[PDB]
Design a protein around this ligand. Structure first.
Ligand SMILES: [Zn+2]
Ligand SMILES: [Zn+2]
Ligand SMILES: [Zn+2]
Ligand SMILES: [Zn+2]
Lengths: 164, 163, 163, 168
């Protein structure tokens, strides 16, 4: 029996009617790998009303993604408000982890000015983790030009961690 | 030594009496894949009202949540409205928004599917915040609109899974 | 670089002094599979009374939960009732209801197994809600019925695992 | 003729929406990429159920303590080098305890002949692991109260156990 495609994404809800395999011992390895990923996504999601948030769920902000949203706010296109960009920034911070930044920080010569930005981003990541609503509120208070700098730095760090 | 079948499903509870391998470094890859699945199931389960207890009975277990809901829609197998609403909460828990958003994005604008996708998305998010509340709302819907909503959710569930 | 054996079991704590690979992209698949298992064990552990401390002593550790329970049933190895009830809570935690429901469904109606399966299922669910409460209930049972219940739970545990 | 997996998705969730040309579809990924992602995701799940409230903690995030690691920090405190305070060493010890698990120590304890003096250390470390798991802030406070020489002994024993479990 082939693996049940519902079970591959989580739990088959079709009871005894379902004729596919729900028995992990007989599944090929690829299906067991795919299911772990869907399940990890669900577990992570299950352990995660503010201005600008609902806008990120609309058709064009979905297509932009959090990065497109933030890059758009920087270039003042696609109608991204500041509120939305701050919410998006919180989402970006949630996706980063400190340890990867510390690793970058450690490759810097001392008194490199990058070190200051790395530490700023690290503190944003930690604030965001403690209280993202608070962190978002702080971000909205920043002058536009410094917000955009901060975003841009965070975006550059996000790209560089991922190509190393 | 072959991997211990108890350890493959979680944790071997047989202490030193057990002669099988509890050492993941010597397991074949297939057994380490199977165990990860049983362990994820357990981790997910470990972080989880009228009509609920009924879903644990022999025939509702055989129907599954989808059988229960489909049965309610066709008024067979003695499924009460209360039970169907609980079962609907369980279906919503199994879905995720992001998959619906992805479907929503394939729609041409002003497609009437978009309205249903957004309705289901809001039910998923309510259910995640407070499933007891979401269930109570569902019980208040007129039977015919409840059945519509269930049916739409079921259809979305099926189509996500065949793409 | 070979994978770091500390990272394989969790997180390497040796900073930059460690010369082994902490980069998953370069690991062989077996090491990535082994690490997932150690990390799942850690995640599960991180989201977890009279007779409890005894189960951590040298000989109860060697017996395992099942040894402890089997010992209590045969009145050997100095297992108190309190301990056996704690150990029973741990056995219940390791079982899951769905597997029992599957067994229950293979039974002809009015089979006396059905009554035991449902009893075990309700114990599993009580234990999941409140294991301290479930342990207290177990302590209140007459020895002879406790031993029956334990034995039934042990038999179900063995049969689910050989099918 | 198909798409390579998205490197962002491999480390978590791609945040580039539809602009991204790489595959976000696990059904078409090679197994190695699915294996790598599971590891990044488990790290994230574990991190998300976890201190800068407490003295000595913030110091462990600085450039040189990061390079030393927890083990370097503890070994440095023992040898009185690299400017590790007692406070920091206690925080680091809490982190080391978090990484260990009791069951492995119990297994070591079971290999010992009775009245072996190792048994006493194994049980001390086991109780530290369990205290730390219940309340790490409390455990850290206790550790700060120990006389330096007994703290260093305890740290050293814990380090040795940590090494030996990992080479068996
Ligand atoms: Zn199925
Ligand atoms: Zn075993
Ligand atoms: Zn290492
Ligand atoms: Zn991508």
């Amino acid at each position: 029996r082939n693996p049940c495609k519902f079970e591959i994404r989580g739990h088959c809800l079709n009871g005894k009617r379902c004729h596919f395999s729900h028995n992990y011992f007989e599944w090929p390895p690829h299906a067991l790998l795919v299911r772990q990923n869907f399940m990890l996504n669900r577990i992570l999601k299950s352990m995660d009303e503010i201005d600008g948030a609902a806008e990120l769920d609309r058709t064009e902000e979905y297509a932009l993604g959090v990065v497109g949203v933030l890059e758009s706010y920087i270039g003042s296109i696609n109608n991204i408000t500041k509120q939305s960009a701050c919410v998006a920034m919180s989402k970006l911070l949630t996706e980063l982890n400190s340890d990867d930044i510390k690793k970058l920080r450690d490759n810097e010569e001392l008194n490199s000015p990058k070190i200051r930005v790395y530490n700023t981003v690290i503190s944003y990541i930690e604030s965001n983790r403690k209280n993202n609503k608070q962190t978002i509120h702080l971000l909205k208070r920043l002058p536009a030009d410094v917000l955009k700098k901060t975003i841009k730095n965070t975006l550059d760090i996000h790209k560089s961690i991922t190509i190393n």
